[PDB]
Amino acid sequence: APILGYWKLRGLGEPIRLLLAHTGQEYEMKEYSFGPEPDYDKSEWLDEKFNLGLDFPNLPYYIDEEEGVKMTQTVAIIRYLARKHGLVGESDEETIKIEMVEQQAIELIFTCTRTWYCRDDDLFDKLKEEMMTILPGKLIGLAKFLGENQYIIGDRITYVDFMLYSILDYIRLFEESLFDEASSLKDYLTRIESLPEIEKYLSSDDFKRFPITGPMAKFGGSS
Amino acid sequence: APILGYWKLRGLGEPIRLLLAHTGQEYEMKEYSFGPEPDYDKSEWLDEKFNLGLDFPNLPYYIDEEEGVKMTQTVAIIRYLARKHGLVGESDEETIKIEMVEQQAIELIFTCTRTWYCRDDDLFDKLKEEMMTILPGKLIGLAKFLGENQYIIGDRITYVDFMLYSILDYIRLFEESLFDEASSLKDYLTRIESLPEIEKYLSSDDFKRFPITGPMAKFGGSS
């Protein structure tokens, strides 16, 4: 039984889980809980961080004793699963578009993370006003790149379609208004939400839209 | 004639340039300068940013009219060049270790960037203290992973060796002391610095260890 380990957060792990659900691959979900308020300690992880044989101990991690796989980097994990299930590029031309979108998606995660995890309230407002300036342009870039395609690379679904759903959804829940004039991307999310196994996943009583981030974060973090 | 476009900083562009020098590929370096103090305007870039036909306009970017390549994501760019010059994995097993190291290297960049660019003074101090706490453990992980290997993956150099060089060097310049319990990595930097074409590149009258970061940054922004 392959094992995916992560916090009880959508976070970075959700794209991987969406891919797994889509591809029908069975896995055990190993979840870690933070400690109580007001410090939300990571003892649950830190007591085991070095006992799993991981080279670069981190969450998330992916372990498959049967295939001798033991990894710990989100993008490395998802690319590995994508390669296995044929959800990668088939030309160098496709691979370029895909890896750009991958990296554009990760860029959105870093700009969102640097704000949502900000401790100072005054700095949070500066970071947010600043984000509200930056994000429309990124979403328009994505809409343009997508055009009238069903998925980001065409009518074939790729691993970055799952990486883009999660981050776009998180942003959506942060501020609907950012999508007020982006029906193209809202239509795209709805297309993904209607893939059978995704519908199944989002319907599960395990699934909840929040928490997205850790309990120490200003946005998300709170069921 | 391929064009690589970046600021006149080492930042995310340097790994790509180290690879290009190593592989003997000819390129034009298109550099952008910041404005005068104390605003350091980005006009040189922003005047032109959306007029280059890039899908996700950003620095760095890579353009090759001849092969119809036009990209804007550092990891995507370097992987593209790696694929073309055979500096990628030769099994899925190698590719896993490579992409882990890639992502571990990018993790180091995001930790150091979130600190060196910190707009607040109190948070900068906390982030620097947090960094000093986090980093020894990461470097030790890298030293262990490397062991008695000449390069990070083994005896064949890959693109993630150039990624790892740059970020380890930047960290070295930030605080030597961080390498006290992981001295294996200083030998590794020396091995990289002695590859013929790298030696050539680092010996150039155009090469300087600083500036690493932009001039608005709290560390690394001064030649």
Ligand SMILES: N[C@@H](CCC(=O)N[C@@H](CS)C(=O)NCC(=O)O)C(=O)O
């Ligand atoms: N909630 C964040 C991600 C949180 C997360 O996964 N953090 C990781 C670091 S990449 C972690 O806690 N690692 C465990 C450790 O500290 O060793 C998001 O939505 O992007």
Ligand SMILES: N[C@@H](CCC(=O)N[C@@H](CS)C(=O)NCC(=O)O)C(=O)O
């Ligand atoms: N010097 C920083 C990176 C600085 C950098 O390259 N910034 C990029 C962000 S990807 C930039 O200026 N891009 C913004 C743009 O092109 O508009 C480092 O240590 O890596």
